[PDB]
Design an enzyme around this catalytic site. Structure first.
Site, mmCIF file in Angstrom:
data_model
loop_
_atom_site.group_PDB
_atom_site.id
_atom_site.type_symbol
_atom_site.label_atom_id
_atom_site.label_comp_id
_atom_site.label_asym_id
_atom_site.label_seq_id
_atom_site.Cartn_x
_atom_site.Cartn_y
_atom_site.Cartn_z
ATOM 1 N N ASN A 133 35.434 -23.099 8.569
ATOM 2 C CA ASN A 133 34.001 -23.334 8.527
ATOM 3 C C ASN A 133 33.718 -24.780 8.982
ATOM 4 O O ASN A 133 34.646 -25.543 9.254
ATOM 5 C CB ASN A 133 33.517 -23.072 7.080
ATOM 6 C CG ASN A 133 32.029 -22.753 6.978
ATOM 7 O OD1 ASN A 133 31.273 -22.844 7.959
ATOM 8 N ND2 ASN A 133 31.596 -22.368 5.791
ATOM 9 N N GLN A 170 28.840 -30.102 9.694
ATOM 10 C CA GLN A 170 27.676 -30.032 10.548
ATOM 11 C C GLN A 170 26.455 -30.767 9.995
ATOM 12 O O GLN A 170 25.473 -31.006 10.708
ATOM 13 C CB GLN A 170 27.315 -28.569 10.838
ATOM 14 C CG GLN A 170 26.749 -27.822 9.620
ATOM 15 C CD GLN A 170 26.631 -26.348 9.915
ATOM 16 O OE1 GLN A 170 27.610 -25.641 10.168
ATOM 17 N NE2 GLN A 170 25.423 -25.852 9.867
ATOM 18 N N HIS A 184 25.550 -17.129 10.789
ATOM 19 C CA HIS A 184 26.431 -18.286 10.739
ATOM 20 C C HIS A 184 27.645 -18.101 11.631
ATOM 21 O O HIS A 184 28.248 -17.044 11.660
ATOM 22 C CB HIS A 184 26.876 -18.502 9.292
ATOM 23 C CG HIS A 184 27.613 -19.782 9.069
ATOM 24 N ND1 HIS A 184 27.107 -21.016 9.424
ATOM 25 C CD2 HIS A 184 28.830 -20.011 8.534
ATOM 26 C CE1 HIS A 184 27.979 -21.953 9.093
ATOM 27 N NE2 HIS A 184 29.041 -21.368 8.579
ATOM 28 N N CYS A 187 26.217 -24.774 13.631
ATOM 29 C CA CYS A 187 27.476 -24.059 13.410
ATOM 30 C C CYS A 187 28.016 -23.423 14.703
ATOM 31 O O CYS A 187 29.231 -23.384 14.912
ATOM 32 C CB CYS A 187 27.312 -23.010 12.343
ATOM 33 S SG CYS A 187 25.994 -21.764 12.708
HETATM 34 N N1 LIG Z 1 23.844 -23.666 -0.652
HETATM 35 C C1 LIG Z 1 24.841 -24.329 -0.075
HETATM 36 O O1 LIG Z 1 25.012 -25.530 -0.229
HETATM 37 S S1 LIG Z 1 25.998 -23.412 0.900
HETATM 38 C C2 LIG Z 1 27.433 -24.481 0.740
HETATM 39 C C3 LIG Z 1 27.562 -25.706 1.610
HETATM 40 O O2 LIG Z 1 28.344 -26.584 1.275
HETATM 41 N N2 LIG Z 1 26.777 -25.747 2.720
HETATM 42 C C4 LIG Z 1 26.758 -26.801 3.702
HETATM 43 C C5 LIG Z 1 27.664 -27.855 3.661
HETATM 44 C C6 LIG Z 1 27.646 -28.850 4.626
HETATM 45 C C7 LIG Z 1 26.716 -28.792 5.653
HETATM 46 C C8 LIG Z 1 25.816 -27.736 5.714
HETATM 47 C C9 LIG Z 1 25.835 -26.745 4.746
HETATM 48 C C10 LIG Z 1 24.842 -25.645 4.871
HETATM 49 O O3 LIG Z 1 24.740 -24.790 3.955
HETATM 50 O O4 LIG Z 1 24.099 -25.583 5.893
#
Ligand SMILES: NC(=O)SCC(=O)Nc1ccccc1C(=O)O
Ligand SMILES: NC(=O)SCC(=O)Nc1ccccc1C(=O)O
Ligand SMILES: NC(=O)SCC(=O)Nc1ccccc1C(=O)O
Length: 215
Positions: A182, A19, A162, A25
């Site tokens: 996810n 995303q 989420h 999401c």
């Molecule tokens: N703190 C974090 O990075 S949560 C892990 C993660 O890979 N998140 C994500 C990965 C890809 C895109 C969006 C997110 C998001 O958190 O919004």
């Protein structure tokens, strides 16, 4: 009911998406449930367009969040949703540019799982297909998940922040789980998936806001 279900093994589930920096999401969750029903009805597995939902579901807030039920209602009232190829994901808000020539699925409405009822969610996954669910994904324990059955007793079932896709369920070394797709890319979790505790008092609110489209 079947003891375990995994719709990835039936060809109902498209690759894991990312995303990006957009809080869409809900749109990915909605497209995943529509993809599963389209495959079940017609034999065709195709990526559907989350951008179509982000830009065009006026009742939702685009990259600021939204409800999957509103997404399904939009597809029904709009008489279509585009394929990803016809309406590519750009990860930002913009005007609605739905193109009816790229329509790839229709929706005849939606159904909701009774709030908090994991047995009903299990029945829906078994009898219907992948189901859109919302969870508390705010904990660093979820953020840094890699493997095993995720359970954090401090998760809040009322903090639904989420949206993801339940594509199956099973048991791993005695721990019942939900198989969850996810939208944080393949490099998150276990190739983009997480196993979430099942029948552990509705852990992370998994059965609190679950729905699927009719087709
Ligand atoms: N703190 C974090 O990075 S949560 C892990 C993660 O890979 N998140 C994500 C990965 C890809 C895109 C969006 C997110 C998001 O958190 O919004
Ligand atoms: N915000 C806008 O520009 S409206 C975009 C759009 O296509 N909306 C719709 C189109 C058809 C059916 C329903 C909706 C809806 O908003 O619920
Ligand atoms: N195949 C499905 O979608 S069943 C989902 C569903 O809403 N189930 C239920 C709804 C209300 C009460 C009980 C159940 C149950 O399944 O035990």
């Amino acid at each position: 009911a079947p003891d375990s279900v995994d719709y990835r093994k039936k060809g109902y589930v498209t690759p894991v998406k990312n995303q990006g920096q957009c809080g869409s999401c809900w749109a990915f969750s909605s497209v995943g449930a529509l993809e599963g029903q389209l495959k079940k009805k017609t034999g065709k597995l195709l990526n559907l367009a989350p951008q179509n939902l982000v830009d065009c579901v006026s009742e939702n807030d685009g990259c600021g969040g939204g409800y999957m039920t509103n997404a399904f209602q939009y597809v029904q009232k709009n008489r279509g949703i585009d394929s990803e190829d016809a309406y590519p994901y750009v990860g930002q808000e913009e005007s609605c540019m739905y193109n009816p020539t790229g329509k790839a699925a229709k929706c005849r409405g939606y159904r909701e799982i009774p709030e908090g009822n994991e047995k009903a969610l299990k029945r829906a996954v078994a009898r219907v297909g992948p189901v859109s669910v919302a969870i508390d994904a705010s904990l660093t324990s979820f953020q840094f998940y890699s493997k095993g059955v995720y359970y954090d007793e401090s998760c809040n079932s009322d903090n639904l922040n989420h949206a993801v896709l339940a594509v199956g369920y099973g048991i791993q070394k005695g721990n019942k789980h939900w198989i969850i797709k996810n939208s944080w890319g393949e490099n998150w979790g276990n190739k983009g998936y997480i196993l979430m505790a099942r029948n552990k008092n509705n852990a992370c609110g998994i059965a609190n806001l679950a729905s699927f489209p009719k087709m």
